[PDB]
Design a protein around this ligand. Structure first.
Ligand code: FAD
Ligand code: NAD
Ligand code: A1AQC
Ligand code: MG
Lengths: 1213, 107, 54
């Protein structure tokens, strides 16, 4: 039995002093990075004046010769949308291979009318064309606007404009965005500029392999290109002759630090094989630089290759370093030293960097200390110049390659390098179809007589458009954008970034408009911090902390107010290896559970008397303690709950965020009149064993209620540690009692007479048992015991033919198989538009087979075990039923080491219809359905028809499809162009409807109000909108003479927050929306006419329809309703036949309420949030029925970086 | 249509053009339910016309028009109300219903 | 362009024939100019061979 964490994340090699200096700079504060860069980039006044003059001369040349798209827009008087739509049409026409067929379709069918008449929106790539036409990036496509614009332009201008559009798109896609469609075509087209002194580096456009097959395809593309380039080079060598550029992410589908062993074992030999071929032809082979978390891993490959004797005698190995990265100078020190050690003159391409907006978003999402890139553009410019000074001092051992389109940058380096030049000393580089105008003012004896290597993309239209958005960001801070801006003077363009930065008041200050990850929420609260699992220092420190956590004697005991209690004790075993004993739990007797509730009741006044601010301070102290203890908590979660390190980090962050969010919400709301319910029983699930556990308890406690915490029987240890932390933070033992044990302990707590409320997260079937238990019960005031029941999902993602397959597959793999599918939010049903289903399914299966399943105390493990053998048995019984029906079943092969634990292989099951699924299958089982585009609305109905409503995902670029699907789907958490497992507290307030929840949402602003007797007004909770059916009902009431009720109806219309529509602060590159909608059909059980009118007013004011109990005999009270109100009103004799309902309002005395509550609990399907009031209460209290619980919260999280870049951050420089 | 607005000229030609900015990403939900009903009974041509009407309808258009500072000038397309349908044939009725429902109207 | 250049004369006629004040006569002529230019622009944005006149 391997020791826990003994092999957690060993580095590829021991970290040298030079490598450690790189890692130390990873997220170094920007004010610390800049001063040495300013010093290194300083040049003499004479040089700065000479450089400014050269830059002015170059810019004057550029501006004096400055269009294709612009000229077309001008000639045909196109609007921007027409220009975009035209280019989309041209793109589609160019997918017709035969020219005569295309020209006939244009002449006879497209021009003559309905272009629509001739499975994929024309506008799938309109975001890219929008960038070409308008210079602005939109994340999604207004396809209805484009369709209108295309019809308009064709009807106005006919075949001539189509012809011009086709010819323009053909030129741009075949000659500008790429040098050629194939390496042979690109090589033929390179001779013209090679004759003038340029060279080439060809990019076959491979990137981000998703499957082994993709990686093999990119490999053979590189290999075939090397042959073609080497044959054409014909002995010109690595400096005069052409070379190739490769991306390591193209060559392996798991290129990441977590998979370092596979990278060195499987990716490295492939690079070596390509390098051996480049060596034989004596051409350059350059490794392009990618995301910041791949930099240091790529150094391990560079090190091995440069030390490999089989590659000796060849100086063509090249490597990019990104000057926007804080590690750049230290990376260069490492490379220069590696060049000296190996004797290889490494070709070093210095760039600024291509992933800036993505790096900002990633660091914010991950809660990391700082960014790995600079946040002010001028800082990157200084960094670049400083790094060029370092490279220019080392030309004997490296070959510097200064890739830039910025004439100021170029001029600074040209003069820094001095007058002594020979080919091979250094070169400039530029991008094909972008940098030639500048470098035609550089290359050649008549210019600056310095060589330039043209980075030359090669590939088809399909391949080029994939990442063209990134390549065009053309941002407001970009030189190429600024050179074309008339409002930007040459003096502004030749400004010396070194001297500008040196003179700033604080050298190197962070950009004012970019939040550090800790500051995403500003003054409201401090964001939780994560850990960087690509940082070798973090991995080394975490390894020790994780090992130390496995040496702790973890226990969970019944922690009553009087002290620990005795009980039945058993071990807690690691689900991934039952030989690994994690700890011991002493379970609570039913007698002690009842005793704990009595003690909580006796202690309730003392805890309610702690002012809300001090209760919130306890939560904040607990969050600080959890943040400090995160590494130890990770180890416990990893071993107890089968979680990977990444998912354990998220778990602890979520707990911290719950604590701080509920603390802040308390500070915003709770006052003396918001009295606690009393003892609250918090029953939590195993699968989020710290986060949901902490969230429910923290909310109840901060609302002033003592808590009986009943954690899932599978995961008592992390719960006990959370309770220990909360108690250390100041929660008294009488206010927070931990009662470990199984459902019997939960049920005994629910049934205890002093239990004043229940917070349950778990399966729908168990919640239904709790609902039945509580139906017998009333509070001492004779009102129902509040139940928050957050339950299962049957979560779907819909993917149309406009989605990017690689993006979909990544989000599907994560959503379906992260945590072995043991998230309530996990993707269960993937719905693929028929035209793309086969391609996506092939990619998904390929990606499935790249997952590593095993015991989770290894960083390389992607998918851990299922929690118990019974869970495994239940999941496998479902898989076998599906397989026994003939459904296609794809499963990863499990390693023999999984035999010591309970594992289920990630599984894809292809279904015929969504009705093939019965209940939630809480495991790593993805079901796949295919749909025809015209059946999209029916499909949404089918998703809704399960009765669940938790998470839902949509992958599309098309606004029409987003509007349609999001308006028709009924789920609590929607996700657009991203995974569906987001539950960021206060950002995606989480919780569903139907079989998935009663609400209110955890991590949202209505939550605390459910845990007090009189709900406060949440922050931002109001709406200026008034339901029009409510207004019609109020007028009807006045016409009937029910004057007081009409006034109450008008008051309800105003008080309702239906229509609230907010954007919640969060990370860049995402829009997180929070909206209040109607719940659905509310069951009304009135006793009196006035009670019915009040119930109807409450329900209509919140947008709902109603089913009114026909047994009330109140039919004559609703005669002559306006048709608008009648449409919302039904009468129900058999409540179970007329559901599902979304809530209920009950009027009556205590025993009537009890009887009605029992009847409601017996209704099939969803748990109903029931509110009851007596007739006298309705008369006395305008809020007898609280409108908070008659609306439904919906959270929507939209990935606005999905088109390939961040539009909002294009303005941030 | 309104004078001084983008629908006006289209009334004065025998085939109306698509006015500038005249589109909507919203699809009337009753139109969608009608299209599904049509597909259920195999009225394939009519269901297609219904979906096409749902898409080409500009119901829900909501624009701010350029104007002076200190003013917001909004232009929105709503349903007309209740449309009188005088069909002759079943297919004609389905096409009329599709047009009226796609634009948010009752009939 | 002609109505704009001749606005002062047109104002005099509108003031005397239709009972308008100077300010409202200005608004009248401006609106006529705006209709002319707006329908001209809308035409340039939309009308093609298939949009036959009534
Ligand atoms: C031949 C060639 C090869 C390249 N290879 C790679 C590669 O392998 N990997 C890679 O990542 N990039 C690579 N690039 C660079 C990247 O694609 C951009 O072209 C480059 O960063 C643009 O810089 P520029 O100096 O031409 O222009 P500039 O307009 O001077 O610089 C723009 C750059 O500034 C940076 N920037 C913008 N805003 C900010 C901000 N707020 N804070 C900090 N920095 C900011 C970004 O890096 C941005 O790209 C390559 C570029 C060329 C020409
Ligand atoms: N909607 C959400 O936010 C959310 C979040 C996480 C998990 N879930 C759901 O939780 C489920 C998985 O967690 P689980 O397996 O631990 O759930 P579960 O229903 O098995 O158990 C949940 C809790 O209820 C207790 N319990 C069991 N029987 C009881 C009874 N008769 N009376 C009182 N308490 C009883 C258990 O001991 C445990 O603490 C899944 O269905 C999942 O979808 C929902
Ligand atoms: O657009 C110029 C460019 C070249 C190579 C490369 C990138 C950009 C990103 C990663 O690899
Ligand atoms: Mg269970």
């Amino acid at each position: 039995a391997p020791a826990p964490f003994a092999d957690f994340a060993p580095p590829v090699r021991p970290q040298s002093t030079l490598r450690r200096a790189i890692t130390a700079a990873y997220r170094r504060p920007e004010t610390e990075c800049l001063p040495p860069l300013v010093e290194a980039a300083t040049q003499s006044k004479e040089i700065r004046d000479a450089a400014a003059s050269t830059a002015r001369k170059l810019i004057e040349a550029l501006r004096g010769k400055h269009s294709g798209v612009e000229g077309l827009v001008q000639e045909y008087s196109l609007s921007s949308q027409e220009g975009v739509a035209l280019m989309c049409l041209a793109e589609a026409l160019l997918r017709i291979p035969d020219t005569a067929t295309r020209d006939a379709l244009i002449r006879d069918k497209i021009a003559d009318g309905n272009w629509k008449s001739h499975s994929r929106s024309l506008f799938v790539n309109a975001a890219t064309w929008g960038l070409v036409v308008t210079g602005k990036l939109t994340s999604t496509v207004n396809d209805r606007s484009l369709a209108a614009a295309l019809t308009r332009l064709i009807s106005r201008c006919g075949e001539p404009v189509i012809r011009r559009g086709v010819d323009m798109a053909m030129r741009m896609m075949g000659e500008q965005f790429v040098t050629g469609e194939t390496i042979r075509e690109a090589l033929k087209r390179s001779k013209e500029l090679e004759e003038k002194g340029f060279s080439y580096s060809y990019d076959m456009l491979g990137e981000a392999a998703t499957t082994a097959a993709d990686a093999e395809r990119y490999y053979r593309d590189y290999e075939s290109a090397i042959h073609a380039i080497g044959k054409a080079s014909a002995g010109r060598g690595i400096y005069e002759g052409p070379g190739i550029s490769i991306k390591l992410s193209a060559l392996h589908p798991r290129y990441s630090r977590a998979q370092a062993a596979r990278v060195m074992g499987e990716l490295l030999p492939r690079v070596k094989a390509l390098a051996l071929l480049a060596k034989n032809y004596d051409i350059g082979l350059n490794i392009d630089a990618e995301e910041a978390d791949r930099l240091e891993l790529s150094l391990d490959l560079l090190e091995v290759l440069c030390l490999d004797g089989d590659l000796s005698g060849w100086n063509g190995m090249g490597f990019v370093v990104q000057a926007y990265g804080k590690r750049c100078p230290f990376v260069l020190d490492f490379i220069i030293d590696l060049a000296r050690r190996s004797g290889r003159r490494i070709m070093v391409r210095l760039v600024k960097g291509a992933y800036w907006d993505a790096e900002i978003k990633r660091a914010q999402l991950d809660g990391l200390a700082d960014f790995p890139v600079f946040t002010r553009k001028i800082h990157t410019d200084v960094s670049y110049i400083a790094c060029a000074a370092k490279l220019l001092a080392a030309t004997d051992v490296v070959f510097p390659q200064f890739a830039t389109h910025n004439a100021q940058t170029l001029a600074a380096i040209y003069h820094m390098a001095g007058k002594d030049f020979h080919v091979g000393k250094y070169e400039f580089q530029c991008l094909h179809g972008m940098g030639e105008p500048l470098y035609e003012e550089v290359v050649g004896r008549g210019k600056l007589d310095r060589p330039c290597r043209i980075y030359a993309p090669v590939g088809t239209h399909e391949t080029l458009l994939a990442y063209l958005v990134r390549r065009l960001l053309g941002a407001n801070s970009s030189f190429v954008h600024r050179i074309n801006d008339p409002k930007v003077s040459i003096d502004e363009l030749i400004a010396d970034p070194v001297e500008v930065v040196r003179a700033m008041p604080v050298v190197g200050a962070k950009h004012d408009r970019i939040a550090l990850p800790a500051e995403l929420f500003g003054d409201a609260r401090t964001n939780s911090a994560g850990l960087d699992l690509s940082n070798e220092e973090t991995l080394a420190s975490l390894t020790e902390a994780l090992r130390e956590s496995a040496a702790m004697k973890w226990t969970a005991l019944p922690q009553l107010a009087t002290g620990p209690a005795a009980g039945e004790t058993r071990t807690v075993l690691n689900p991934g290896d039952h030989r690994d004993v994690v700890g011991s739990v002493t379970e609570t007797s039913e007698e002690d559970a009842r005793r704990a509730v009595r003690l909580a009741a006796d202690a309730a006044p003392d805890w309610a008397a702690v002012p809300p601010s001090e209760r919130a301070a306890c939560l904040d102290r607990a969050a600080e303690l959890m943040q400090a203890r995160m590494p130890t908590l990770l180890g416990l979660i990893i071993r107890e709950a089968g979680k990977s390190a990444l998912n354990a980090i998220a778990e602890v962050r979520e707990a911290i965020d719950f604590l701080r969010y509920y603390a802040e919400q308390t500070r915003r709301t709770l006052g003396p009149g918001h009295g606690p319910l009393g003892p609250i029983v918090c029953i939590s699930p195993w699968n989020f064993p710290l986060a949901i556990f902490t969230g429910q308890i923290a909310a109840a406690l901060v609302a002033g209620n003592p808590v009986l915490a009943k954690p899932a029987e599978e995961t008592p240890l992390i719960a006990a540690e959370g309770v220990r932390i909360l108690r250390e933070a100041g929660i008294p033992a009488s206010a927070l009692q931990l009662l470990p044990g199984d459902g019997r302990v939960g049920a005994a707590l629910v049934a205890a007479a002093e239990t004043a409320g229940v917070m349950f997260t778990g399966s729908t079937e168990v919640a239904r048992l709790i609902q039945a238990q509580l139906a017998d019960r009333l509070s001492p005031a004779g009102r129902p015991i509040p139940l928050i029941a957050e339950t299962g999902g049957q979560n779907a993602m819909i993917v149309d033919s406009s989605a990017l397959a690689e993006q979909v597959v990544g989000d599907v793999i994560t959503s379906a198989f992260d945590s072995a599918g043991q998230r309530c939010s996990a993707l269960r049903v993937l719905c693929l538009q028929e035209d793309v289903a086969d391609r996506i399914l092939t990619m998904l299966k390929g990606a499935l087979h790249e997952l590593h399943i095993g015991r989770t105390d290894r960083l390389s493990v992607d998918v851990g075990p299922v929690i118990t053998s019974e869970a495994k048995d239940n999941i496998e019984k479902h898989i076998e039923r599906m397989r026994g029906l003939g459904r296609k079943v794809e499963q990863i092969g499990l390693a023999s080491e999984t035999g010591v634990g309970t594992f289920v292989p990630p599984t894809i099951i292809e279904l015929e219809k969504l009705s093939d699924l019965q209940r939630e299958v809480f495991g790593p089982v993805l079901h796949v359905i295919r749909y025809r585009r015209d059946d999209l609305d029916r499909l949404v109905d089918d998703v809704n028809a399960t009765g669940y409503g938790l998470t839902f995902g949509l992958h599309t670029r098309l606004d029409e499809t987003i509007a349609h699907v999001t308006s028709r789907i009924k789920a609590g958490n929607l996700y657009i162009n991203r995974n569906i497992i987001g539950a960021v507290v206060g950002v995606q307030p989480f919780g569903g409807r139907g079989l998935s929840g009663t609400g209110p949402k955890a991590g949202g602003p209505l939550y605390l109000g459910r845990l007090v007797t009189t709900a406060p007004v949440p922050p931002q909770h109001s709406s200026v909108h008034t339901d029009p059916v409510l207004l019609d009902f109020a007028k009807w009431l006045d016409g009937k003479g029910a004057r007081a009720e009409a006034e109450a109806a008008r008051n309800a219309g105003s008080s309702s927050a239906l229509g609230l529509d907010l954007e919640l602060p969060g990370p860049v590159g995402e829009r997180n929306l929070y909206t209040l909608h109607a719940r659905g059909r509310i069951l009304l059980v009135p006793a009196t006419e006035s009670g019915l009118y009040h119930q109807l007013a409450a329900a209509l004011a919140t947008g709902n329809s109603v089913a009114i109990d026909a047994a009330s005999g109140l039919q004559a009270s609703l005669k002559n309703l306006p048709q608008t109100v009648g449409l919302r009103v039904s009468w129900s004799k058999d409540w179970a036949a007329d559901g599902p309902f979304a809530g209920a309002l009950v009027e009556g005395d205590a025993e009537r309420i009890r009887a009605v509550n029992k009847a409601i609990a017996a209704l099939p399907g969803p748990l109903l949030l029931v509110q009851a009031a007596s007739s006298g209460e309705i008369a006395r209290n305008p809020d007898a029925y609280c409108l908070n619980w008659l609306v439904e919260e919906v959270s929507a999280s939209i990935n606005t970086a999905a088109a390939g870049g961040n539009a909002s951050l294009m303005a941030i420089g």
